[PDB]
Amino acid sequence: LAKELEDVNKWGLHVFRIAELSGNRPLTVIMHTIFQERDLLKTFKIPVDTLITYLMTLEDHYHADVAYHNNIHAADVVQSTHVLLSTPALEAVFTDLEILAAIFASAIHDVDHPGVSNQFLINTNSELALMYNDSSVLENHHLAVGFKLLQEENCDIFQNLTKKQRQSLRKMVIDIVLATDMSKHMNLLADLKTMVETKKVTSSGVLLLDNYSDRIQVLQNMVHCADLSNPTKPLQLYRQWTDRIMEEFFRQGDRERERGMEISPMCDKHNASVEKSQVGFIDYIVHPLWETWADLVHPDAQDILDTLEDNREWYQSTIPQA
Amino acid sequence: RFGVKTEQEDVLAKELEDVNKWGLHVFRIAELSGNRPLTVIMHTIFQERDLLKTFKIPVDTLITYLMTLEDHYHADVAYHNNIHAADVVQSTHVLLSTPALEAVFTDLEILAAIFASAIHDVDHPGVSNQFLINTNSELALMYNDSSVLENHHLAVGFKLLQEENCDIFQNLTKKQRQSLRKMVIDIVLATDMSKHMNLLADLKTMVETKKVTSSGVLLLDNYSDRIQVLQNMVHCADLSNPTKPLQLYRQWTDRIMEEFFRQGDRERERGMEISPMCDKHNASVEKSQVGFIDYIVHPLWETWADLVHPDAQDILDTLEDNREWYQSTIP
Numbered sequence A: 001l002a003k004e005l006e007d008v009n010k011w012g013l014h015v016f017r018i019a020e021l022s023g024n025r026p027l028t029v030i031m032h033t034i035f036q037e038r039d040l041l042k043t044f045k046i047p048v049d050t051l052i053t054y055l056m057t058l059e060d061h062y063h064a065d066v067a068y069h070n071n072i073h074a075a076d077v078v079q080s081t082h083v084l085l086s087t088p089a090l091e092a093v094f095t096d097l098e099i100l101a102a103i104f105a106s107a108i109h110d111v112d113h114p115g116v117s118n119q120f121l122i123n124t125n126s127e128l129a130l131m132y133n134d135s136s137v138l139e140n141h142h143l144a145v146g147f148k149l150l151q152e153e154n155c156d157i158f159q160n161l162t163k164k165q166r167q168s169l170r171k172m173v174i175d176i177v178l179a180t181d182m183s184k185h186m187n188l189l190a191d192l193k194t195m196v197e198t199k200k201v202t203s204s205g206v207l208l209l210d211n212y213s214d215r216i217q218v219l220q221n222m223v224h225c226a227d228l229s230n231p232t233k234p235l236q237l238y239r240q241w242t243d244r245i246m247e248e249f250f251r252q253g254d255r256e257r258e259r260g261m262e263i264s265p266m267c268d269k270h271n272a273s274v275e276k277s278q279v280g281f282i283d284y285i286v287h288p289l290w291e292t293w294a295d296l297v298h299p300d301a302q303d304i305l306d307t308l309e310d311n312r313e314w315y316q317s318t319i320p321q322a
Numbered sequence B: 001r002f003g004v005k006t007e008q009e010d011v012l013a014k015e016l017e018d019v020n021k022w023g024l025h026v027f028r029i030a031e032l033s034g035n036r037p038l039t040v041i042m043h044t045i046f047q048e049r050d051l052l053k054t055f056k057i058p059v060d061t062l063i064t065y066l067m068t069l070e071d072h073y074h075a076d077v078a079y080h081n082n083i084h085a086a087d088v089v090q091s092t093h094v095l096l097s098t099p100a101l102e103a104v105f106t107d108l109e110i111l112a113a114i115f116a117s118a119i120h121d122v123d124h125p126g127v128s129n130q131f132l133i134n135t136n137s138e139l140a141l142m143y144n145d146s147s148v149l150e151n152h153h154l155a156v157g158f159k160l161l162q163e164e165n166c167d168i169f170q171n172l173t174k175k176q177r178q179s180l181r182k183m184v185i186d187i188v189l190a191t192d193m194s195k196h197m198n199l200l201a202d203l204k205t206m207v208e209t210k211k212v213t214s215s216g217v218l219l220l221d222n223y224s225d226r227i228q229v230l231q232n233m234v235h236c237a238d239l240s241n242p243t244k245p246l247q248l249y250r251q252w253t254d255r256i257m258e259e260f261f262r263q264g265d266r267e268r269e270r271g272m273e274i275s276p277m278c279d280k281h282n283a284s285v286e287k288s289q290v291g292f293i294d295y296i297v298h299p300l301w302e303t304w305a306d307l308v309h310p311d312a313q314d315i316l317d318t319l320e321d322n323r324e325w326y327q328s329t330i331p
């Protein structure tokens, strides 16, 4: 396990092995490792036992019976964000508090996920959709639950931050997790594209982000990229993620069919095209986003983009075409 | 007769004759109805607009829902109570009938605006969003510091539909329920003052490019146009106190100050900074009302008056007279 954690600063860490080796505690192990690596416990005077207590409770609140949106996905997004934070184009740009916010946001961003979509929750008149007025239903809930867990016994990892730091961190984390709602994707992308075209860099080629709006925008898209990073990973990892999302989707589709509902796109196990669906996912969502991130940090993300394009060509390879 | 049983009734009927008028004496209605102004006024309006027949709402279902809704406005909150809800409902009802908007809205849009008005402050605790945020309340935790109370009012207002014999929308189609739900959410979220400046700016833009028939009736083109007018309409109703007959306005001022001072007392007790205009020891009630009109209420109503010109001219005139009252009573 210690050997596998040597790759914690590398894209494509084998998170599934981490999960197996840690007794299904990938989120706790990876968060702890990253907090030590970034010296965050010292910087913010976080008691190690408080950190571990919070992380284990947090991890407990990801559902074991949800195939994709579980603690392994959370650990993956945390670790991917951790790698992106260290991209050369962003060297010394973000404060320790901003870094803490991005990583914490990643860790909680899907907590207590039920394995069905916002639209399903809206369409089925769920209590969650009633609570949140059909608006970013799950993302609001992830935030509420993630913060609420800080209240459990010896779980307040932010106990030694100043009031101002707490308030700032809370705002940033909320802004980041709400940006993981796919209903915001096109607007986020449109604005990121415009940021890229007017971007400013130092002599060494480091990005200049002069206000909160530009800074939080980059953190939002960073964690969104991490959330949408599966197709950019080594193929053996990507195939496992594809298996899991389809299992989750098909279970939702089964519930829709039981309820006499129209079956959502890609949720029908009898009429599904896995390869077609991943190529569409890459072409219409993942590549447009990642090519824009790559533009922002050029050339830092070229290897990531190369893998994505290779994986796209792979998934397309068994689909007959004119 | 009037859906609550009162003593008297004939006197209540005389007051309800003004349900179509600005400056209905809603405090009188509240007293005459045994503190059921929201139930009585909503009942009257639904009957007047024939909404029970249109949407096949059983009258007993309507009264049951209204009574339940009214019960969830706090009796010990001086301003944000069932009288305020009744007032905003009745004010929206008048604004909907303004000549410039004749035949513009569907019955479902009318139902949405009235329903939104009725629930728009339900279960209000008598403290602000910012107070709830500053004190780390469960509500602010639930709603991530964003439109905290307004999200709550919606959730409660909708949830009460699920109580026994309370679903006034049971005979709407699936599509109608979905449309009404979206409109009601859009309207109540627009009552968040954090959205006021943007909302007014966009209303100004709409006024600059407004289209009218030769009889000065507004032409709205799409959902965006219609919901924008409905959002500003209910926001105007929410902010209509200073445009009312002075005796009504004077009572609303007394009540909001009572509520604000109570929040300031909670702040002082916890050693927090006391919020603007919430410090009973250092208040200028009259000066604050003039400020309120100059910076919030007049800019809004002047723009609404433009939109429906000349429908709201008298409302505007009353506002200016009332500003002068509070000006004239600054110590």
Ligand SMILES: COc1ccc(-c2ccn(CCC(=O)N3CCOCC3)n2)cc1OC1CCCC1
Pocket (backbone or CB within 6 Å): A117, A180, A181, A182, A227, A228, A230, A231, A241, A242, A243, A245, A246, A249, A266, A277, A278, A281
């Ligand atoms: C490996 O496969 C995927 C991995 C991740 C996603 C995916 C889509 C959107 N996100 C972002 C988070 C989100 O908001 N979601 C989660 C999915 O459901 C909708 C709300 N993530 C999709 C994947 O593929 C789907 C299965 C058929 C092709 C599409």
Ligand SMILES: COc1ccc(-c2ccn(CCC(=O)N3CCOCC3)n2)cc1OC1CCCC1
Pocket (backbone or CB within 6 Å): B128, B191, B192, B193, B238, B239, B241, B242, B252, B253, B256, B257, B260, B277, B288, B289, B292
């Ligand atoms: C008659 O007096 C008032 C009547 C209504 C308001 C008022 C302000 C904003 N709204 C819109 C609803 C809202 O969002 N609120 C409610 C008040 O607290 C802020 C969140 N309503 C203010 C009044 O005066 C205050 C006392 C000092 C001057 C201001």
Ligand SMILES: [Mg+2]
Pocket (backbone or CB within 6 Å): A109, A110, A180
């Ligand atoms: Mg999510």
Ligand SMILES: [Mg+2]
Pocket (backbone or CB within 6 Å): A283, A287, A288
């Ligand atoms: Mg492309």
Ligand SMILES: [Mg+2]
Pocket (backbone or CB within 6 Å): none
């Ligand atoms: Mg190289």
Ligand SMILES: [Mg+2]
Pocket (backbone or CB within 6 Å): B120, B121, B149, B191
């Ligand atoms: Mg309100």
Ligand SMILES: [Mg+2]
Pocket (backbone or CB within 6 Å): B219, B220, B221, B222, B225
């Ligand atoms: Mg138009």
Ligand SMILES: [Zn+2]
Pocket (backbone or CB within 6 Å): A073, A077, A109, A110, A180, A227
């Ligand atoms: Zn996710």
Ligand SMILES: [Zn+2]
Pocket (backbone or CB within 6 Å): B084, B088, B120, B121, B238
């Ligand atoms: Zn109100």
